[PDB]
Design a protein around this ligand. Structure first.
Ligand SMILES: O=C(CCCCCCC(=O)Nc1ccccc1)NO
Ligand SMILES: O=C(CCCCCCC(=O)Nc1ccccc1)NO
Ligand SMILES: O=C(CCCCCCC(=O)Nc1ccccc1)NO
Ligand SMILES: O=C(CCCCCCC(=O)Nc1ccccc1)NO
Ligand SMILES: [K+]
Ligand SMILES: [K+]
Ligand SMILES: [K+]
Ligand SMILES: [K+]
Ligand SMILES: [K+]
Ligand SMILES: [K+]
Ligand SMILES: [K+]
Ligand SMILES: [K+]
Ligand SMILES: [Zn+2]
Ligand SMILES: [Zn+2]
Ligand SMILES: [Zn+2]
Ligand SMILES: [Zn+2]
Lengths: 370, 370, 370, 370
């Protein structure tokens, strides 16, 4: 039906972060790994693209790369002191950009590309050249603060793309919905005092950043009311995430009236993920994509951009990604998710489901949406 | 303080199960993995032993191997038709023992060793040669039915050891507590009609076998009252698992009065596990070990055996295993768990904790323990 | 300069062969591998394509896939009894097609694709739509006999493409030059009695098939004089391989006067290869490509097809492949081979070089070329 | 027959060197590896010990660890400026100790252990507590210069052990025979001016250090005549290496009359090694061990120590190591090398063999041994 862009570049798969045993740095009591290392591996993302190819989906999409984000683009978000230190470490062979921010040689130029893919996806959709678009942006962006890398993120991908669109393409109100299972603390910080961007994060209560829930953080000054955190309970599955979208996110969008919806699209709420404890399956992600595409249809002429964030289940993320691209493009391949029925049977029973529904009801009331 | 046995054999690390992408068999829509493959990898278990060595713990334990379980030992549990088919597949190069039971060449002899390590651990403790013991039994046992492999298990390790002890060492009542995060369906089936073994399983509601909770399954005929299932909510952490032990398991043991406690000790309730959604840390496992050691001290002269089951977080399981061996032996090394404080901060907040406490209270009432 | 085809398909990277420690099957005394497994891994070939992309070469080539080779195409070479057994094993989950021929689920359809890429490359060049072409055909073909898989090969890729071109496109004389470091025993067998195809193999003396040199095997009946084996000494490097091309292969082509040259292009003579003992570098492969392209220019209007075979050095093969594609297309990227100068310094000294030159001189005399 | 020490420590397997694709550092044109990384991996050495265990050999050996080499031990070879910089990099998380010397966190203490295992092996044999001994020393030592790391070596293991034995145990003349396939440039440098140690290196001509042969380097001043380099031709196999031992090494030992023979025992001349081009099999290494054990029996009361160096064929090195330990201890297990007959068939034919024999004859004449 739609003309759907897929923005990606081989170079994004070349970003490295040194030797880790899953998330632990090697040394001391942490033995080096015999096989695969850091959880933020290129394979998480490359396997999704590989499955899109063998499924026959890829040739029916508009495939694109992009020019890297320029220095000027980076500077709408990040000060030079941060950028220079990121680039120095990148240029000297890789190393640490403060605690638990490892990067590799040439990571700077690859992070600029990753942000440039997001910039170009936003631009194509805004200019009406595409109906909607997905950016396979690695490294991710949603934890990055202006002057601090965190949670495997080095540049604030979505804010860079948005700020560029506001400066060059007259973009007005935009909503950012972050269903990566971790809290989008970088996006929240950047837009905390602004009423022209609504930031919504669904996330696992207390997961990352650790110990953060955030429901009382609504924004400050002019931005008060324009930040929504939905801390879902660890263990929640398909029913809970879809109910939260239905009850909180879709009504919030209706009230705000954006001209563009952007999804920070992680898959780490999937049921086999080592970096969170949620129980989503590929049909969960397909249903959430349909819900936000339908909202985009009602509110901003169908303009929807999705930007890849997290997801660390190497065998399972591809099936979730494929589902999203199928829902986005309107094209169904012959692929059947081999774990779907298994994960459907593992879903929380009625007691938990109702408990979580009531917690979501209390949040919607607290946010003035019910 | 204690004389603690550690039973293990290099050959257990040589059991293989063919090519998988985590748990998915390769083929069709599942792309072959570039690095590590099946989640049930030798590294999950070998890294624990490696950390015990470098920590200085190993030389303070009684290290042992064992003779494999004999055919006669296997036949107290398993009929010959199953055993012959397992051995035929093992002897012909590996393959499938029905659906989703892959094994490799020589797996039969390695499964017999794994069960023999459990037999010998039970025997050493029963005969008073050791105070307590741990068996690093791979492949695991707690899903195996008499005539059906399941959940990476090929022989019923703990039942074989128990049935041998009943036949050769006059063992009477024994309690089996299974804190692997999946349901011990094999142990439950084998002892379902018996009052001489109490089987207790704490597990994630609906996880594996998928869609099974089990609270109403209490045993049949003479065995009614002697099976206890505790389906904990996905997402539960340290508070919940320890409260369930305190409120249900310790009182159940006090009522039953065993002569030996055996733990089916998996670590897959750890907070980084891809095969479940629980939030335990190394101190959770240390505290659960202390609770059951203390019960063994009160009830059966300190006689406690632990038998390794699951745990698939390759970087994290070693820290959990070390904690158990430290608590079992009474010796504290200088190792500090580098994720402990991180996972403590991710723990469910009070709302969930109280909800899960009330669910556990309802189970204890239903089981006549409150 | 040229219009160069690059024929490849994502599905070729999905062929698997079960669990191996490099080339050894697991079991018995062979411990399962912790990381990567069979040497014939998709990464050997995928890393070459990945480097072509990041170098900027790929968009300057004519990229294509192909229809799989049909049953009729396969049957010009292979009898049905072989084909049916290959397909049965493929369809039943993978397994063994006799000794040391492991394949995986769906390998049949992927081998048909691999052969179809070669068919299409030959066709495009023959019809004048491309000047020259490379096929990234995996699994490889040059060891496959009509009724027997061997050396990781399941279908005879190049013979299938040639026989199809003879039947459908009026192809006459064709020369096949095989510089994979192992002997092309499948190609040699298929064309042994034919004067319409000249098969030339440069290979490591005695490497694979093991213990075979082959210099006295010249062909039989009408085919006598139309098979040339050049068993080079283990340890030989750039000087030796280029001298053999210069002294034996180029004059043999001049005498035969082909209408098309096909290269069976392996990279396993590279200096870091675990499956042979030769000392070639990326400039060796670039120089050999230039030599055969120049011959094609003199003899058959520039018509040259290259078909990927072997090469198992995962970090080094990409640099060798890139060099070939640069020489084939006439386009030089900015990539500099980081091991080039190192391997140049390891090359055999003058004593060995002259010894090997004299051995090549004796062969050229024996073949009537000097 | 013999009482054979095997000195090893789990901690030696914990030394890491960052992210590499085989030997290439990641970055620039080198894509990060999906699976295993640096060729100098713990698995090369751990798989040998694992096979010794499952073969039943290990319990028949004298197993030992050791105290790390002290600062005083290190300072007999290395100046403080080098040692302090090695330790600073080790203590700060790992990094580079000049070009192509990557090390990891804590590598300093693990290198001191590796050297301490060699010290203790030499001591046990010298004091008559063992007949002979093997040290599984990782990281290796034979390339290390006093003030420069090279070729994966950080401390000069064998020189440290020898210099300590000369200072504390009255050791006189000692011969060091290095059959690692690369040149022992560190040992050669350290003893170049000394007549109390004879250093002999068999190595692949020009391999590592690259472009070095060394036959004319015989020693300087008092040390002239006490260094022997044997640059064997790339491609050489069992016949050549054993003939060189027979014709050059055994007569050189007979002339020098040592009180102790030490072997720098690498396995990287094995026929599947990516880091050299030789064709040895497990029986080659067994025969070389017998030759030097027999010399030790004739010359120095059977006193032989072997110290692990290189070997990077992960599936094959274990079989070669097992063979050495079988020959050293006098105990034959039931293990049969599954590649033995294959590699026997790949061996160079008579033409090459005789050529290499004549080259060895010329060296023996040049060294005054024929
Ligand atoms: O996917 C992400 C990043 C999530 C990071 C979660 C795990 C972080 C971690 O493991 N932290 C840690 C590591 C070592 C020591 C202490 C904390 N964001 O969307
Ligand atoms: O650790 C265990 C075994 C748990 C197994 C859980 C995952 C099983 C799985 O992934 N099942 C599956 C695979 C392919 C297709 C459908 C189901 N028991 O303690
Ligand atoms: O690259 C190839 C295939 C070469 C195969 C060489 C190694 C074969 C092997 O390792 N054989 C073997 C394995 C196990 C036992 C005995 C032989 N052809 O071009
Ligand atoms: O095993 C050893 C060490 C041998 C090292 C051989 C390979 C070195 C290498 O690959 N060098 C290189 C890497 C990158 C760029 C240039 C040279 N010694 O016994
Ligand atoms: K989120
Ligand atoms: K805002
Ligand atoms: K359980
Ligand atoms: K019971
Ligand atoms: K060849
Ligand atoms: K012919
Ligand atoms: K040497
Ligand atoms: K000397
Ligand atoms: Zn995330
Ligand atoms: Zn489990
Ligand atoms: Zn080959
Ligand atoms: Zn070496």
């Amino acid at each position: 039906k739609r003309k759907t862009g897929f923005f990606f570049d081989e170079r994004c798969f070349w970003h490295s972060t040194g030797l880790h045993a899953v998330t632990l740095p090697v040394g001391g009591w942490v033995q080096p790994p015999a096989g695969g290392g850091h959880a933020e591996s290129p394979e998480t993302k490359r396997r999704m693209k590989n499955l899109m190819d063998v499924s026959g989906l890829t040739p029916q999409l508009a495939l694109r790369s992009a020019a890297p984000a320029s220095l000027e683009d980076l500077r709408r978000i990040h000060p030079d002191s941060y950028l220079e230190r990121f680039k120095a470490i990148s240029d000297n062979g890789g190393g640490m950009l403060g605690k638990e921010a490892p990067l590799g040689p040439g990571s700077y130029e690859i992070a600029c590309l990753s942000a440039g893919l997001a910039c170009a996806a936003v631009e194509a959709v805004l200019k009406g050249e595409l109906d909607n678009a997905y950016s396979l942006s690695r490294p991710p962006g949603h934890h990055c603060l202006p002057d601090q890398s965190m949670g495997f993120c080095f540049l604030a991908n979505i804010p860079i793309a948005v700020e560029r669109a506001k400066a060059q393409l007259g973009l007005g109100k935009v909503a950012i919905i972050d269903w990566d299972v971790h809290h989008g603390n970088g996006t929240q910080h950047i837009y905390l005092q602004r009423d022209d961007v609504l930031t919504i994060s669904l996330h696992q209560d207390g997961c990352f950043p650790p110990g953060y829930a955030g429901e009382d953080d609504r924004g400050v000054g002019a931005g008060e009311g324009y930040n929504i955190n939905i801390p879902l309970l660890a263990g929640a599955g398909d029913d809970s995430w879809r109910y939260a979208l239905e009850t909180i996110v879709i009504p919030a969008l209706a009230r705000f009236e954006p001209e563009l919806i952007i999804i920070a699209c992680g898959y780490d709420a999937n049921a086999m993920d080592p970096l969170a404890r949620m129980q989503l399956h590929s049909d969960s992600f397909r249903a959430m994509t349909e819900q936000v595409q339908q909202a985009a249809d009602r509110l901003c002429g169908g303009k929807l951009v999705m930007v890849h964030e997290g997801g660390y289940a190497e065998s399972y993320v591809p099936f979730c990604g494929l589902a999203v691209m199928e829902a986005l493009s309107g094209i169904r391949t012959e692929v059947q998710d081999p774990l779907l029925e298994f994960i459907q049977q593992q879903q929380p029973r009625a007691t938990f489901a109702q408990f979580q529904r009531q917690a979501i009801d209390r949040l919607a009331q607290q946010f003035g949406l019910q």
